[PDB]
Amino acid sequence: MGEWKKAREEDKEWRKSTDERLENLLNIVREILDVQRDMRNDLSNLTRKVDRMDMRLSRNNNMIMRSFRQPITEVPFFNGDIPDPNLPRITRIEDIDSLSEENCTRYLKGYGVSYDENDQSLWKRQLAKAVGLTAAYDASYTFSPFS
Amino acid sequence: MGEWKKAREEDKEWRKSTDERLENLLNIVREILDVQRDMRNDLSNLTRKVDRMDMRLSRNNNMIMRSFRQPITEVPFFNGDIPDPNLPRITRIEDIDSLSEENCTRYLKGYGVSYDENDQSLWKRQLAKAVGLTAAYDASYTFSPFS
Amino acid sequence: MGEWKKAREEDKEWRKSTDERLENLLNIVREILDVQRDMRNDLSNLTRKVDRMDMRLSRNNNMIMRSFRQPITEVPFFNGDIPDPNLPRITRIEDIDSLSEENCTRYLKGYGVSYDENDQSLWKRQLAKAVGLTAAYDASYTFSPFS
Amino acid sequence: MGEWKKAREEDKEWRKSTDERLENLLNIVREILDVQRDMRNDLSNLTRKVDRMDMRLSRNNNMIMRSFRQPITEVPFFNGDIPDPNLPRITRIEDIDSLSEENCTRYLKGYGVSYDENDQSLWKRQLAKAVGLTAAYDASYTFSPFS
């Protein structure tokens, strides 16, 4: 029964080792969870950045392309998707100049560029400058007012 | 034997703490597994997007380059690899205009652009517009029919 | 009581299995923590590299664009942010040639290009060459000295 | 003592639950380690691919830029670093045509393009075609032999 008691004691000490290692597991996996959280945030960051750059290069290439009387191409949205396929694809300036106002706002949202709710006068120009309609004729043309 | 009994009980309570911490490990590592699943999905997303943009810029640069009677360069596939090295590299328009139909379909698949199985007439033009053959002569040239 | 003793021993052996598996958990999660550390370092690396390339392409595109008397666009910083919005956006060369010295240093820091604290004479030219002011007139123009 | 015995057995069964959950931890963290291994491989893949594309676009842009008698820019290596800063930066064709042979080999390695150890005659041309020296004069010029 003595040996039972000492054995008992060692057991409890064994319990303590077990317990502290279990705590080791607890905190280590806590740090792992936090690290994975922050990596996920980092990856979200990188996704936003790649999509941004995509929009940028598509635009700037339409820009040069416009100098040769060549049609422009579609442009992705600040989040990556192709625009709402009900929303008319864009090819030249009068296409814009004929668009509806709500669609103009939709677009302006699609390119992440902020406008004023009252100054219609700058919507068309700023949208042009967003997609890349930049040629000399693109400057000399005059936008029409809405209905 | 009394002390044995109370000791026994404490052991059992100790068991309960052990058990609930073990459950802590279980669910925390479950969330970690799910988070890693997600992250993997996110990274797949980012890979697709980077490859996409790669194709886009290669094309658009061949586009400008075509304006100066300069040869075009090879173009990656929507998934990144170089094309099937048995598939003839592309340098100018007649190269396409001499290609076999099955190879045309192969290409059209390689650039992720959908065509119609019956309208051969638009394959060549749409492939051109995919790689970047855009010059004025590129418009004035007439494609030949297949064999 | 015999059976108690042998049973006791078995449990001790059972304890050893438990212990070694716990060590298995310990070292495996250690390696996981290290692997996540190094992945985080890798991702930081990739972020720096993507931002770098972003700056590069923005610049080089302003470069071509300058050949056609077309205005330049803003440029990101070596770390990604848009410049200090109090810091005047840049459109052409005289804009620089009118800037204050401390702002020049700020910029030069923003583009990660090193200069000399005494040789003011090369600041303006090197900043130009950093953003892309490259045209023939951009070479023939003479910078003004500071106040 | 009866109750001691039954209690003892339940404990043993409790041990079995503990053991199988521990195995649950073992294999689940094994899969996690493998998944992280493979993600690391995937990320290495993505790094190589982004650097590749970087080299590609830098080159192709020097290509167009060459058509206007404009100086070329430095080019990254297949692994991302800037070249050995003791290795002379490249600006035009005669710069190459004056280079040492070992430096030529160094370069050819820097751009991941394979050459023949005996045919010196194609080194210079292929290096040109690697960086982008593409203009009509770039074709009409004749390379000089080594010392």
- Give one DSSP letter per residue of C9-31, joined into a string: HHHHHHHHHHHHHHHHHHHHHHH
Sign of CA dihedral C66, C67, C68, C69: positive
Cβ atoms of C53 and D51 within 8 Å: the answer is no
Q: Is A142 left (phi over 0), alpha (psi -120 to 50) or beta?
A: beta
Q: Chain C closest CA to D30's CA: distance in Å? A: 8
Where chain D is broken, by preceding residue (C–N > 2.5 Å)? none
Place of tokens 């390379």: D143
Rounded Cα–Cα distance for residues C12 and C15 (Å):
5
CA-to-CA distance for C130 and C107, rounded, in angstroms? 10
Neighbours of A3 (CB within 10 A): 9
Residue D115, C-beta contacts closer than 8 angstroms, at least 6 positions apart? D105, D108, D122, D123, D126
Q: How many CB atoms lie within 10 A of CB D96?
A: 22
Amino acid making up residue A43:
L
Alpha-carbon span B69 to B90, nearest angstrom: 15
Residue C89: CB atoms within 10 A of its CB come to 12
Cα gap A140→B139, rounded to integer Å: 27
Helix (H, G, I), strand (E, B), or coil: what is residue B123? helix
Q: By C-alpha distance, which of A137, A75, A127, A132 is closest to A101?
A: A127
CB-CB under 8 Å, A63 with C58: no
Neighbours of chain A (3+ CB pairs under 8 A): B, C
- Cα–Cα nearest to C72, from C51, C43, C96: C96
The tokens describing D52, both together, are 């590749």
What is the rounded CA–CA span in Å between residue C122 and residue C96?
Answer: 13
Query: Which residue carries 């030219």 as its tokens?
Result: C125
DSSP state of D71: -
Rounded Cα distance between B137 and B93, Å, is 10
Nearest to D64 by CA among C72, B136, C64, B53: C64
The token duo for B82 is 């170089």
Q: Which residue is closest to B22 within chain A, CA to CA?
A: A22
d(CA D53, CA B53): 10
Write the CA distances from A125 to A66, C51, C92, integer angstroms.
16, 29, 21
Are B101 and B32 in contact, with CB atoms under 8 Å apart?
no
What token pair was written down for A21?
Answer: 């290692």
Rounded Cα distance, A87 and A97, in Å = 15
Residues of D in contact with C53 (CB under 8 A): 50, 54
Is C80–A49 a contact, with Cβ atoms under 8 angstroms apart?
yes
Tell me if B77 sits within 8 A of B111, measured CB to CB. yes
List CB contacts (< 8 A) between B25 and chain D: 25
CA nearest to A65 within chain B: B64
Beta-carbon contacts of residue B20 (< 8 Å; ≥ 6 apart): none
Q: Which residues of B touch A53 (CB under 8 A)?
A: 53
The closest of A112, B65, D63 to C82, measured between CA atoms, is A112
Inter-chain touch B73–D60, beta carbons under 8 Å:
yes
Instruction: Give yes or no for D34 touching B (CB within 8 A).
Output: no
> Between the CA of residue C137 and those of A64, C69, C92, C140, what are the distances in Å?
20, 10, 11, 5
* Touching subunits for chain B (3+ Cβ pairs under 8 A): A, D
Number of other CB atoms surrounding residue C3 within 10 Å: 9
- Residues D76, D61: contact at Cβ < 8 Å? no
Residue B119 token pair: 């309208």
Taking the Cβ of residue B42 and every Cβ of chain A, the question of whether any pair is shorter than 8 Å is answered with: yes
Which residue among D33, D68, D73 places its CB closest to the CB of C67?
D68
Residue-range domain boundaries for chain C = 2-140
Six-digit token string for A75 = 């442009």
Task: Give the whole-angstrom CA distance, residue C104 versus residue C120.
Answer: 10
Report the distance separating Cα D52 and Cα B26, nearest Å.
42
> Which residues on C lie below 8 Å from A23 (Cβ)?
none
